[PDB]
Amino acid sequence: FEQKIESLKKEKDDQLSEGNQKEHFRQGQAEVIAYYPLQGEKVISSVRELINQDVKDKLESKDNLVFYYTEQEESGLKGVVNRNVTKQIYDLVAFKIEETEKTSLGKVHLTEDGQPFTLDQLFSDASKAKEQLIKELTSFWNFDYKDSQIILYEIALPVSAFFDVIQSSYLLEKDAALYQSYFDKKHQKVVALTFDDGPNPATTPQVLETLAKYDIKATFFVLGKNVSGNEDLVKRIKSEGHVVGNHSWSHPILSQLSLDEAKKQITDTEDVLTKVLGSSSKLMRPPYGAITDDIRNSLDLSFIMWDVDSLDWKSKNEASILTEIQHQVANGSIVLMHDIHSPTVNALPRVIEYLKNQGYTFVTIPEMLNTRLKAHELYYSRDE
Ligand SMILES: [Zn+2]
Ligand SMILES: [Zn+2]
Numbered sequence: 001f002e003q004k005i006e007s008l009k010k011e012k013d014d015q016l017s018e019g020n021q022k023e024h025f026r027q028g029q030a031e032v033i034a035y036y037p038l039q040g041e042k043v044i045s046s047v048r049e050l051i052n053q054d055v056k057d058k059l060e061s062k063d064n065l066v067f068y069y070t071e072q073e074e075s076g077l078k079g080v081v082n083r084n085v086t087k088q089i090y091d092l093v094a095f096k097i098e099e100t101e102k103t104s105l106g107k108v109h110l111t112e113d114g115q116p117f118t119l120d121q122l123f124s125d126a127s128k129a130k131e132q133l134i135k136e137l138t139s140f141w142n143f144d145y146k147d148s149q150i151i152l153y154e155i156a157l158p159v160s161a162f163f164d165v166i167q168s169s170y171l172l173e174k175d176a177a178l179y180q181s182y183f184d185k186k187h188q189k190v191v192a193l194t195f196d197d198g199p200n201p202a203t204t205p206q207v208l209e210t211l212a213k214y215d216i217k218a219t220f221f222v223l224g225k226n227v228s229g230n231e232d233l234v235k236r237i238k239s240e241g242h243v244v245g246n247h248s249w250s251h252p253i254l255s256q257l258s259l260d261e262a263k264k265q266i267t268d269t270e271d272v273l274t275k276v277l278g279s280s281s282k283l284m285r286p287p288y289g290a291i292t293d294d295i296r297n298s299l300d301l302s303f304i305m306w307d308v309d310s311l312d313w314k315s316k317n318e319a320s321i322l323t324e325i326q327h328q329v330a331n332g333s334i335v336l337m338h339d340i341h342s343p344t345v346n347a348l349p350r351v352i353e354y355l356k357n358q359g360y361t362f363v364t365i366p367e368m369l370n371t372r373l374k375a376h377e378l379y380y381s382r383d384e
C-alpha cells in the first residue's frame with residue numbers, strides 16, 4: 001500500500017515536475033498534490049485560484065490521493081493561450097488501485113505573460129458585445145474558441161456575428177480573412193433610395209425620368225389602393241428596372257388592426273401587384289414602420305424598414321431633404337423618401353448628385369440584401 005502510493009507519486013513527478021511548482025497538503029483524510037504551472041519563474045495565479053476553488057468547494061475526498069495539474073493549449077485567438085486543468089482522484093482503500101480523472105475540470109485563458117484573458121477583452125466595447133451575445137444566445141463568462149466560433153456554458157456562436165465590436169487583432173489567419181471579407185462588405189459604398197405611398201400620376205413619372213437620367217434604380221413601396229387606374233404607371237416603374245414593393249393597401253397602422261385584417265391589407269396588395277406585374281418582389285414596408293411579430297411570422301415576405309428618414313414628408317423643403325441625406329446616409333443605408341409630392345421630385349437631382357459625388361453606388365433593395373433576404377425577417381439597412 002505504501003509502496004504503491006510512493007509509485008503513484010514518483011510517476012506524477014516524473015511526468016510533471018518540470019515547469020511546475022508542486023504543492024502537497026492533507027485536507028481532512030485526503031492527500032492532495034497540485035502542480036501549478038510556471039510562466040517564467042512564477043506561478044500563474046489564476047490557475048492556482050481555479051484549483052484552490054475546487055479544493056474548497058468540490059474536492060470532498062474521503063480517503064483518497066488527489067492530483068491537480070495542467071497543460072497549455074492554443075486558444076485559437078492571437079497572443080492568448082489556455083491552461084487546461086486536470087483533476088485525478090485515486091482510491092487506494094480498494095484491494096486494487098482505482099482512479100478517475102477529469103481532463104478539463106476547468107480552463108483559464110491567458111496572455112503570453114501569464115495574466116488572465118477575459119471575454120470582455122475580445123471586444124472594443126464589452127457593453128455592446130454582451131448585447132449581441134445575448135441575442136445570438138437567446139435565438140440559438142467561461143468560454144472556449146474553436147473553428148471560428150465562440151462557445152459559452154455549450155452553445156457554438158459564429159464569431160462573425162460580433163465582428164462589429166470585436167478586436168480583430170485577436171483573430172488568427174483564418175478568422176482574419178473572414179474579418180477582411182466582413183470589413184470589405186461593410187465598407188462597400190452602396191445606398192438604396194426607396195419611395196413610399198405611390199404611385200401618383202402627377203409626380204411618379206417625373207421621379208422615373210430623373211432616375212433614368214442619372215442611370216440609377218430605386219425601390220417603390222406602393223399602396224394597393226393607388227394601383228387601380230394607374231396600372232400602366234406601375235408597369236412603367238417595373239419596365240424601367242426598379243423594384244416594386246408592398247406598402248399595404250390603404251396605409252393603416254397595421255399593428256392596430258386584427259391579425260387577419262392586417263395580413264389581408266398586405267396580401268390584397270400582393271395580389272394586385274401580382275396581377276398587374278406578373279410577380280412580387282416579396283418586399284413589404286409597413287406604414288409608419290408599425291408591425292408585429294405575428295404579422296411578420298404569418299407571411300412569406302421580408303419586411304423592409306429604413307435607417308435614413310429624409311423627412312421629405314415633414315419638411316416639404318428641397319434644401320432640408322438634401323441636408324438630411326447629406327448628414328445621415330451611410331454605407332448600406334436604406335433611404336426613406338416619398339414620390340408623391342413636388343419637393344421630393346425637385347430635390348432628387350441634387351440628392352443623387354451629392355451621393356454620386358461622394359462615391360456611392362445606388363442599388364435596389366434586392367441588390368442590397370440579396371443573400372440576407374429571408375421570410376418574416378425585418379431589415380433596417382444592409383447590415384441592421
Ligand atoms: Zn484515468
Ligand atoms: Zn407611407
Ligand SMILES: [Zn+2]
Nearest residue numbers: 299300375376
Ligand atoms: Zn416561413
